[PDB]
Curated annotation (Swiss-Prot), chain B:
Physiological role: Stores iron in a soluble, non-toxic, readily available form. Important for iron homeostasis. Has ferroxidase activity. Iron is taken up in the ferrous form and deposited as ferric hydroxides after oxidation.
Keywords: Chloroplast, Iron, Iron storage, Metal-binding, Oxidoreductase, Plastid, Transit peptide
Species in which this protein is naturally found: Glycine max
Biological process, per Gene Ontology: intracellular iron ion homeostasis; iron ion transport
Enzyme Commission number(s) of this protein: 1.16.3.1
Name of the protein described by the UniProt record: Ferritin-4, chloroplastic
Binding site for Fe cation 2: E79, E128, Q162
From Swiss-Prot, chain C:
Subcellular location: Plastid, Chloroplast
Region (Extension peptide (EP)): 1-27
EC numbers, comma separated: 1.16.3.1
Any single GO BP term: iron ion transport
Keywords: Chloroplast, Iron, Iron storage, Metal-binding, Oxidoreductase, Plastid, Transit peptide
First-tier enzyme category under EC: oxidoreductase
Range of the intact protein held here: 47 to 242 of 247
UniProt source species: Glycine max (Soybean)
Protein name stated in the entry: Ferritin-4, chloroplastic
Limits of the Ferritin-like diiron domain: 28-181
Annotated binding of Fe cation 1, by residue: E45, E80, H83
Cellular component terms (Gene Ontology): chloroplast; cytoplasm
Top-rank lineage group of the source organism: Eukaryota
Subunit composition and interactions: Oligomer of 24 subunits. There are two types of subunits: L (light) chain and H (heavy) chain. The major chain can be light or heavy, depending on the species and tissue type. The functional molecule forms a roughly spherical shell with a diameter of 12 nm and contains a central cavity into which the insoluble mineral iron core is deposited.
Catalytic activity of the protein: 4 Fe(2+) + O2 + 4 H(+) = 4 Fe(3+) + 2 H2O
Length: 194, 196, 196, 194
């Protein structure tokens, strides 16, 4: 027999009184809170790197407008991934802690591979690294028995990340097939209108 | 790899129940899981009833907090929906729903120190946290018993929603504390009354 | 407070990019056992699609003339092929290699003197759906045992809840067929299904 | 010149009474029924092979999206061809007998020709094989004097098969003209948006 007011007597007492404490926080341990903050920083870093890549391909002497557009839009998307995690942190009553963002590379030319292929391979590696970080976040949730955090990560991030990795892998493959010069420019035109 | 449907189908073909009272659908759904689902149905129905009591209090002419009355009324209906979804789930899995008794709730929600509004929102927050604990319990029963789909159902249909409900009410508690009793509470209530 | 340095940590991720043309660029933490298990499930779904197509072909006979059942099995076959295709697409998303396997010859006749054709076929369909559920849970188990988080989640999300609903749907058909009885009742049930 | 009820009472007593017998079947001999079941299996097999082709070209490292889409659509179309023959079998009161489907090739790479050209040449060969089988089915119908079966095959299948063969032949020719690399990728873009 479940008596709400009997079993809720204790709960009503646990309600925080000091203004700075979260009222919502429940079964959300410090390590989980910190793991979410770490992932916010990972997504924000990738956003920043993509913005650097946009800035490179937007150069008049590089003039790959499709790549510039793709990286510009990707940068915006990554910031949204970071923001979703910041909002999640607050839903669970953790405190968002934005960390420093390191200076990214500015130049993406590559003598052998060519700038386009080099940049897409870097992007692929960045998305694979992001996947590793997400799987680490998931591992922290699972270790700490945080069922809803693990579900949130699976549902909002993991499937999406698999799709992002396949998408970029396909770009790498196509850039390898078309080759430098005319081929790269044409692939770029495709991307511009994709 | 190699797979012969008509050969392997033998197992389950002669496992099709023949007595009218037995579930045809039930598969890898143990009694403990069925019982835990019935327990959660009762938890949700209970919360629905408590919110209905809170509605009835704030709907009093001398209390006259129309925003809170509306919020609790809608919350009661939503809770009943949560119970019903679990009743439907029980039947999807071939378990038998067993509705249990519902206890008489408190009727008065006044509080000298906190004021009625803040007291009731704090109670609502505590009820939602208690419900979260019970939902996570249900998830634990499923995981312990190895019921993959029951665990997935609880996470997917209930857990994220419960986190949202808790933050929502926490924000109400915070605002009520900030505005203070009297004019502030009344103003907060007006906000809640017209809240989108 | 620098806790993450992308260009330092990606160096490993970069010197791991395949240069051999036949190798997947996307594949990451997706082991052979998981790839094999997904290929097995593709074959399970394709086999079920084929069986449903055989059942369609039987109920579409002029002398059987149960148009509702024929329509149901025809649609079920198409849906099952979609289940197979979604797994083929998933295999490629993860950078596994799809390997389609042989499909065995299904039964062609679904007559049954005592149960009647309709009830017999629905009971068979129920058993096939329960069998598929066992197979899906087996796939989930392979993922969980190997620690493939996203594969487990894909199976839960895209297949397991759906399978539970499919099982209840067909269980209800079996129950109704048993209630209405052979002859006029079965024909009437079939009309309902034709227009459901 | 013609009295329906004189000639019909003999026909009326020929109407089957046992529930397992087709009521519709008329002038449809076992050889024709068998030949129709054979063609069902041919079409279903081609459907499966096309699905294998789709699965190959949908690989991230192959990344020919136009070819993948073409083979995916061809697979669905081929299954429809099989289903139409299944429906026809039932119209004539024959009994459909689905047969086993063999494991198809999974890899379609080719060092000399390149993957795209090789796959299109294989597709052309498959469609020519299907055409031969359809013509054989027509031959069986004619040998047995089944006028309507012959007509069904020529009306519903033979013209379509000629179109399919020209279509794929044109793809082979274009792939040969554009050459490997940038050319193949461009052809694939054309096919993707065709
Ligand atoms: Ca991201
Ligand atoms: Ca935004
Ligand atoms: Ca803290
Ligand atoms: Ca999940
Ligand atoms: Ca998702
Ligand atoms: Ca795609
Ligand atoms: Ca609830
Ligand atoms: Ca309702
Ligand atoms: Ca029982
Ligand atoms: Ca889970
Ligand atoms: Ca949810
Ligand atoms: Ca909000
Ligand atoms: Ca299925
Ligand atoms: Ca499809
Ligand atoms: Ca391999
Ligand atoms: Ca689902
Ligand atoms: Ca229903
Ligand atoms: Ca064909
Ligand atoms: Ca169709
Ligand atoms: Ca026969
Ligand atoms: Ca002719
Ligand atoms: Ca024609
Ligand atoms: Ca033309």
């Amino acid at each position: 027999i479940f008596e709400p007011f009997e079993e809720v007597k204790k709960e009503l007492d646990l309600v925080p009184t000091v203004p700075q404490a979260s009222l919502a926080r429940q079964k959300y341990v410090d390590e989980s809170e910190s793991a979410v903050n770490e992932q916010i920083n990972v997504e924000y870093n990738v956003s920043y790197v993509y913005h650097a890549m946009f800035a490179y391909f937007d150069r008049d002497n590089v003039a790959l407008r499709g790549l510039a557009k793709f990286f510009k839009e990707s940068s915006e998307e990554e910031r949204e991934h970071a923001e979703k995690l910041m909002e999640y942190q607050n839903k669970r009553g953790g405190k968002v802690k934005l960390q420093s963002i390191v200076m990214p590379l500015s130049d993406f030319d590559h003598a052998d591979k060519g700038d386009a292929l080099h940049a897409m391979e870097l992007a692929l590696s960045l998305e694979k690294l992001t996947n590793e970080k997400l799987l680490n976040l998931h591992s922290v949730a699972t270790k700490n028995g945080d069922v809803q955090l693990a579900d949130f990560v699976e549902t909002e991030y993991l499937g999406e990340q698999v799709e992002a990795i396949k998408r970029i892998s396909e770009y790498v493959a196509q850039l390898r097939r078309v080759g430098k010069g005319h081929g790269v420019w044409h692939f770029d035109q495709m991307l511009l209108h994709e």
